[PDB]
Design a protein around this ligand. Sequence first.
Ligand SMILES: Nc1ncnc2c1ncn2[C@@H]1O[C@H](COP(=O)(O)OP(=O)(O)OP(=O)(O)O)[C@@H](O)[C@H]1O
Ligand SMILES: Nc1ncnc2c1ncn2[C@@H]1O[C@H](COP(=O)(O)OP(=O)(O)OP(=O)(O)O)[C@@H](O)[C@H]1O
Ligand SMILES: [Mg+2]
Ligand SMILES: [Mg+2]
Lengths: 52, 469, 458, 485
Amino acid sequence: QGYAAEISARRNAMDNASKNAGDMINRYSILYNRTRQAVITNELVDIITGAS
Amino acid sequence: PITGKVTAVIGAIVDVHFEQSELPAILNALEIKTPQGKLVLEVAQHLGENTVRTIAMDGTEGLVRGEKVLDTGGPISVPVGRETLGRIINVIGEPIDERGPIKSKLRKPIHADPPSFAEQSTSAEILETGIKVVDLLAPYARGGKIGLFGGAGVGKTVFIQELINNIAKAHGGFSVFTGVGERTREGNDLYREMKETGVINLEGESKVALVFGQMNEPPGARARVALTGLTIAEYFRDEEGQDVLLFIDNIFRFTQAGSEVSALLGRIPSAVGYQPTLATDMGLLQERITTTKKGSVTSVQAVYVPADDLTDPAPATTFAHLDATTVLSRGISELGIYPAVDPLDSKSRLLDAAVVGQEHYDVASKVQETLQTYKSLQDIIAILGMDELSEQDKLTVERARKIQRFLSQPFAVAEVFTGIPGKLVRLKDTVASFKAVLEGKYDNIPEHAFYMVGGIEDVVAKAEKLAAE
Amino acid sequence: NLNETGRVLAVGDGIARVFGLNNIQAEELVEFSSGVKGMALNLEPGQVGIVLFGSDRLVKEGELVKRTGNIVDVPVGPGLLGRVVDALGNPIDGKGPIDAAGRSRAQVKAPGILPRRSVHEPVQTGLKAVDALVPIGRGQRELIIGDRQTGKTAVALDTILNQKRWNNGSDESKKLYCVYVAVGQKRSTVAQLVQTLEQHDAMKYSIIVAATASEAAPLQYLAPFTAASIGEWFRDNGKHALIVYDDLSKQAVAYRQLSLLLRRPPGREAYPGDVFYLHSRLLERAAKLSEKEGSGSLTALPVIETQGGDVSAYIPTNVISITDGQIFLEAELFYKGIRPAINVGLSVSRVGSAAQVKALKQVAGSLKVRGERLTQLLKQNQYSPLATEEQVPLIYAGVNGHLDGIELSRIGEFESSFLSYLKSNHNELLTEIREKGELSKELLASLKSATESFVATF
Amino acid sequence: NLNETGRVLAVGDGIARVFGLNNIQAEELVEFSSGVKGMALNLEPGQVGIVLFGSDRLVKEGELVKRTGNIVDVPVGPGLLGRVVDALGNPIDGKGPIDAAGRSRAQVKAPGILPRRSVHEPVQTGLKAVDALVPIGRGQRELIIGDRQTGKTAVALDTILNQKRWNNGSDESKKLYCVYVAVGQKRSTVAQLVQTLEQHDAMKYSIIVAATASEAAPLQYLAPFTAASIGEWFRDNGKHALIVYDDLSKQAVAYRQLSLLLRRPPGREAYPGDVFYLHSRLLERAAKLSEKEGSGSLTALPVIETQGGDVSAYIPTNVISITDGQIFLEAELFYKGIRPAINVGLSVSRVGSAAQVKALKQVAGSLKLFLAQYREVAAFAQFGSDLDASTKQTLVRGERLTQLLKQNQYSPLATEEQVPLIYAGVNGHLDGIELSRIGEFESSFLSYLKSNHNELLTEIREKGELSKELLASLKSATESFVATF
Ligand SMILES: Nc1ncnc2c1ncn2[C@@H]1O[C@H](COP(=O)(O)OP(=O)(O)OP(=O)(O)O)[C@@H](O)[C@H]1O
Ligand SMILES: Nc1ncnc2c1ncn2[C@@H]1O[C@H](COP(=O)(O)OP(=O)(O)OP(=O)(O)O)[C@@H](O)[C@H]1O
Ligand SMILES: [Mg+2]
Ligand SMILES: [Mg+2]
């Protein structure tokens, strides 16, 4: 009964873990896009100021 | 006409000098009588010394300095009216279908000024499309903007053709399609599909006017095709008094062409790389799609999202205008539910009890809750089996699946491929039918009776047909 | 006569370079032959730079430019009430001309330290959550910040609609006139907002300044300053005004456009360095004045759209630095059905309790299973504003515990059934809570006798 | 005479500024006294900006420049078959001059909507992973994308080598002439590529247009367009051409250099604004024409080198948006010994499924699903006996299938040899064979059908589609082999 219980609690635990991983991915997927936009803008500010 | 001479050629930018001291106005169209067809240039700036800086609508190769240029006396003018129906037009208003001239009596400029505040519609209203899922769970606004999402296999072109046919039958309104910066092969596919469906008929009354810019065209052309299609739509509005659909595919390419033109004209690029004029350039186009006392222009716009970022300036500025969204998904097609509209990711600002009414809003809300709960338990349903549910959750699932296949609809355009007769479903009938399903009045009818029937009055006959079988 | 007239040397990117106009003032308004108006932004030797309040198509090289003799100015007065006006004050509703009481500059300094007074009288929004947890005072700057489709406009529209019960009364000092600056908004949305205000009769006391997305970037830039100069008339003549800016993000975008087209070097987020100055001299004008000046007040509710829900962006952070608070509307709550989606955590009014009605501060006991029903009670339908004599009992029954015993789905029906009964039977207490504004302990007990009775009768 | 001639004012890096040349045409070719020639990309009010096809050392201030009157053009015809030419059409293989059948401009308009036709004919690559799961049609634009040393050049070159089955036949409608645009590639790599082609006799139907890393940037910018103008002759004369651009990222780099030295305002990634109008104007000249125009075609396989496999970059995004599909080659599969390293999950052909060979479609329809399931179960595999039988079957099949789709380079297989193998696999007949011996199986199987069932291969390729009866005979031969294998 302990073996069954630990398997079930190792199936629900990793479920919660994977869903928390999904939420963290959905946050870092916004942080990433923000950094992407910032990087492009600033690289181009540098290029323009060099070209002025 | 007032004659000038070219002085500089730097890519798609051409500077013209006008010695007579009678200069062309900004956004006016100059044309050079080159071999292999005359070339149109649009005035972008007045630089001084009687010199005007312009953007070319076609390749500038072969231009000599000192080449003669004529001022057309107005902006790019395009033909309008019935004659444009069933024909392919370029940005500068020429026939590229090679079936001859468009012998329209009128020509109108594409740089029209949008209607005044005093001429707007004071209250919102729905453009009944005949498609159950849209008209119920995400209705399209009259005079509004509708964003269509999805790529291949999801039936986008058939959806467009069905919108055209339904509007032409219910509302009598013609339609205009603009391919802005998309692939040429896909436009030929659309042309042949439209000939087979029956929305283009070279020997009769066509329903849709085609304007086709494409990737091969310079950025200055892509930046203006939409205004040509918009002018045809506006002419069908203001003169004939119709409710006219305007398809744009793709709008991100309008934004991108604007960024390219800005970069070429020397303007300092803004945020992630778009033109500083982004919001105003989008507005000058979108705010002409609006309802007036004469009629309404309603726009269906394909909206590509760079890097899947709904926060890239182009998506953001587009979404700021959109009144509705319709998401076509491969997943809903794998379930066989054509026209594949995701009833839960689609949305509309006009789905409010003030606009549609409570009779409608209650049905829509209940339907979305049913499907949302079904989706919210759509895994344990497989693990534990449908029998392990609560009886109430079981009933909600039986309603959900039945509704899900009741959102299916056969299209009259697809008849020539699917062989099934196509149907309209009016808004009254759709709302009443889904209320009847929600109240359980047709629980005892098997699921398959809801697949591609139309209204509930046909669910009846299909239940009887299954009974015979 | 080059002293008062000039000729366009060049025109492009919305900027016009003009010869002459020797005697021109800085920021002076100029009229081109085509009737299009411009602002003399930069003066150089032998040439003047003019921003165009209109499409550049209307201007051509060689065309004459004339001095109007006046800094950029807007008509002001009470004759504007019930009207829609463009950024320069021209009527666009077609109801006729503006019976202006005078004209006032667009760019005028905020009043200094001495003329002001502490904000101490409330702007009753009719919304439980704002009136009770993040109060807005007369003279405050309170930012409504959120993502798209999150209730931003509805909060300010309810604040406008709710004032009708006072704007009708004879008491001139309780009235609150309203101004709504639609920057970047579609003319259709503005026309629908106008029809909504008209069908609720809220237009008698509201002014709409519209610089829509089809309007040239200079006009989007200018509209808020003229709306402020309109509110400042009510302020400076002893009357109370409220100004909603919907929304400053698009004014910032328009100023970025105007600047980058003038080759102004880009800073962070490609925005110009002077965006903080764009907003600070706009929002500092919202001030509560002393009895030496006449006790007027201008209340600013700026609106901001946040990309992806991030408050760490440049413009949001700038306006948070300028303003005296923020009401953060969160999309997660909106989709969950919590409408208005007030994030009570990120929300704060740094003047706070000073403006709040004494009744609600006495009752609430700093409201910032029981809490779930409290949230359900804070939910509010659009265009359905509540009075303070109605809000006080609703917070009362939940803070003192009465509501914990009622089914969750049924709270929305208690609210309807209680305030009706309290009105049908116990209007005396409502009249006291309204007139006095502060509960006596004996009226605290009367409210307990009412709630402990009705909860049982429900 | 300042109409026909001019004088140099300044010489920078690959750029020159010339006074005069009033009557000069935009994009016109000019020759300096020293013999170096260049193209006039910028015409200004009082000077002309000319990009040089050679070293600055050959141009000095005060030097005379003479115009040719000819916009940049390339020779065209069949005489170019078997030749190696520079971007301007000068032969560099050391053999004699080219008997051009005319000349054609580089920048010429792509064909429009009306004259095109649905892509309906197969471009048989001979690579099992492509013909079966990501097919290419005659008229398609198909992007080969992936990191360095992942198999791109090999895919293109195997496609080129395979067509000798047909280009030696008399049916002019099935032949497929080939063009390879080596842009930014090493000169030694092009030399040994030419040698690989000449060993397999592929050269007589191939053309190599070479703009190597040591050649000026203008030539790297031009080469793709001149190869397109070469293939367009075949397109327009009712013949079928394939053009492989290896690779367009270096063309974008050349254009960036060319524009920044001309001081044109840059955009994102330092690239000019209209790079999209560079790659589209290049690619969508590929087309399948209608009967009114001779029903020719030109097929484009552009190559893009993605750093770190990121497709978020600017030029890759643009080309992914322009093309009718992509073939994604992944390093993760390459260094695990899979060859070609085609990611079946990311690769897509939006057109070719209509063009695919029927014999292959019938048998491979389910290979997409089996592989998509294997790609999931692969993570769980290493655990062992714990796995359910309904997943052990998947794990047994997908291994043999992945080992089948891999093949050695310069060995492109005929459809008649491809369909039996995909059949044996999808129908699970290989399950009784150790995964280490599949290569022994295939090489043996071909010999058996060729030696004892040739009638069936002959019918497969004569008809292209499997009758009710041919599927049965194939099942019989496959099982009789697997049993006795
Ligand atoms: N308090 C509320 N309760 C319920 N629904 C509301 C409430 N306020 C607004 N809504 C609804 O939600 C929608 C929100 O639109 P809103 O007025 O918030 O636009 P906005 O967010 O200010 O501007 P945008 O959506 O363009 O960013 C409206 O359709 C309205 O019907
Ligand atoms: N199918 C295959 N089987 C075995 N080896 C292969 C296969 N395909 C490619 N290779 C090997 O991998 C290497 C691939 O170089 P290839 O000719 O593909 O250039 P590439 O992958 O485009 O690299 P680069 O980006 O440097 O051109 C070669 O050494 C080749 O021998
Ligand atoms: Mg709003
Ligand atoms: Mg290679």
